[PDB]
Structure formats: structure tokens, C-alpha cells
Amino acid sequence: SMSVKKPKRDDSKDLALCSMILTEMETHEDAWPFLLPVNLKLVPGYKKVIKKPMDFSTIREKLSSGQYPNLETFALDVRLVFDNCETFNEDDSDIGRAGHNMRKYFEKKWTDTFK
């Protein structure tokens, strides 16, 4: 509350560390469905169904230009990528499996880097 604060967690490395995580996600062999925005002209249904499209290249640009206020807003966009994928893709498809794999990979790196 006013003039009453918990001890200051050091957040000075968060930007660098989210960039490293994002590099590791970008270079994973199963990243290919997620590297670029879904082409809304060429993929029927996507525009109407997926209210907030997100992809690794869009996260990279937001990261690089100070559009994440804190590390939690960064994780919310990474998770959005996988939540969108599960909304649109069957679990038993190459893309569906890719999304599960990547979400697992992300959540481990997130825990090991920050928790």
C-alpha cells in the first residue's frame, strides 16, 4: 500500500533473458507454424475465428521496441500463440502436435529462468 512495499525483485535482466528464451523458441525445429503471422487472406476461417493473432516474429518486434511493460505481458503473448494454435488445429495434426511440444518447451524454460 502507500509507503509499504515488498522487497524489490531485480528485473534488470528480464529483457535480455526473454530475448534468449525467444531465440531458443525461434530455433526449435517445431517452430515453423509460429515463425510468421498466419496469412489471413489465404487461410479461410482464421480472421473471424482467432480474435487476437500472435506469432514469434510479432513478439520479437514488440520485444525489440519496448512494447512489453513487464515479463508477464511477454509470457501472455507467447501463450496466446499456443492457445490460438489449439483453437484452430486438431491435436492429431502436425501443427497441433507442434503447438503442444512448443508450449512444453516454453513453460520449462520459463520456470527454470524465473521461478
From Swiss-Prot:
Domain Bromo as annotated: residue spans: 9-113
Tissue: Expressed at varying levels in several tissues, whereas a smaller transcript was expressed specifically in testis.
Ranges annotated as spanning the membrane: none
Location in or out of the cell: Nucleus
Its job: Regulatory subunit of the ATP-dependent BRF-1 and BRF-5 ISWI chromatin remodeling complexes, which form ordered nucleosome arrays on chromatin and facilitate access to DNA during DNA-templated processes such as DNA replication, transcription, and repair. Both complexes regulate the spacing of nucleosomes along the chromatin and have the ability to slide mononucleosomes to the center of a DNA template. The BRF-1 ISWI chromatin remodeling complex has a lower ATP hydrolysis rate than the BRF-5 ISWI chromatin remodeling complex.
The protein's assembly and partners: Component of the BRF-1 ISWI chromatin remodeling complex, at least composed of SMARCA1 and BAZ2B, which regulates the spacing of histone octamers on the DNA template to facilitate access to DNA. Within the BRF-1 ISWI chromatin remodeling complex interacts with SMARCA1; the interaction is direct. Component of the BRF-5 ISWI chromatin remodeling complex, at least composed of SMARCA5/SNF2H and BAZ2B, which regulates the spacing of histone octamers on the DNA template to facilitate access to DNA.
Family: Belongs to the WAL family.
Protein name as annotated: Bromodomain adjacent to zinc finger domain protein 2B
Protein species of origin: Homo sapiens (Human)
Taxonomic lineage from the root: Eukaryota, Metazoa, Chordata, Craniata, Vertebrata
Range covered out of full length: 2054 to 2166 of 2168
